[PDB]
Design a protein around this nucleic acid. Sequence first.
DNA 1: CCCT
DNA 2: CCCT
Lengths: 218, 218
Amino acid sequence: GHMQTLIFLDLEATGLPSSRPEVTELCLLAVHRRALENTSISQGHPPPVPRPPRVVDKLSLCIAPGKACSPGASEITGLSKAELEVQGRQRFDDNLAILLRAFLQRQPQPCCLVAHNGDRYDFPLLQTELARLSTPSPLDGTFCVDSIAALKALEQARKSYSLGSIYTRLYWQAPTDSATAEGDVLTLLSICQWKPQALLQWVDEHARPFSTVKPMYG
Amino acid sequence: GHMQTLIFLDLEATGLPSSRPEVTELCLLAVHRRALENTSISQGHPPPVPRPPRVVDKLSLCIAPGKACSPGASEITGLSKAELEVQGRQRFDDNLAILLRAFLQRQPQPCCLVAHNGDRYDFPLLQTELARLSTPSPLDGTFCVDSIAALKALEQASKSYSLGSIYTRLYWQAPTDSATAEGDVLTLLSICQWKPQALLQWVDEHARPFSTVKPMYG
DNA sequence: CCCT
DNA sequence: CCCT
């Protein structure tokens, strides 16, 4: 009934939902409630990009997909199944689920996941990948929330609500290292640090369990 | 008999070995053999700072120590037991050992740890922290190597061997984000990317099992 | 002599 | 219309 740790999440995959994609890279960035509360309210025209908090748990992993990547997805991310296999990256396996659960348990509960276009992409895909695994879902007790829905509410308080479009609106800069699991998570964090205590309170009242998120396929 | 994944490691602690320290933060950065082999040989006067490889697994975690930090250690790292406790960071517990083991198992074996002044600080301390845990050591099958010994051999080939002193010698820049588990690991990676295929071959011939590393105390 |  |  109150979120103690916001886990900023983003995945890079082989393609769009219509292509039945598989995760090629993921990145989680755990940050405590009071880490965000202790952050500068973005003032000035333009305001500076807020510094990430000091105490922050992070996990960036590369994953070998079972199928090839599309030319458009390969170019922007700069990844391919051939390259991931040659560097010995393992599949989305049961070992990965253990690694997530161990990482999650360190974070003070209740934790809420945060992903841009998460309710329509990052969560259903992650749920579908966890559906393949014989082990139970490690994100069972955790909550989730789409940052697009959050920023729409905050900013109305008349168009593109993309990750890159929001970041450039707020701070008037190009995102650093686009098309990388970590780079997009860091960009998402910066957006959420715009009005953090306002964002936190919205997440509390609109956060839902990850188990309620229906999968992409299967 | 041949290292497939170099895991760049560094810890931030409550103090020097003489003070019997405890880990306040750690960061692992796994990179495949071929990732380093596919890297620019640093040419030009001065040479540019090499780009980190694309496919790279990373894990940065904050840990609550059982004892207070020294004023000198607190200032440089910008951390304290009071702040770590208030943000709900757990102790160096059995859960952490599982998280390391799960992370390690993803990396193609045999993997070798790399830490600056590791044989005298980062490895013995990590061994002492793992000695407290009731579970077995997750770094059992892994190897290790001190980057100081590596760079001494490479640089004498064709005085101060600190992490900051080496980085400034090679590229003529100040390290980005000093006194942070991740920032020091990224600095170490850059140093090792100076002559990577030469560094790799030295690590092979001087890499030893982590279990041979005697602990700092206990 | 180097890590914190 | 947004994620890759």
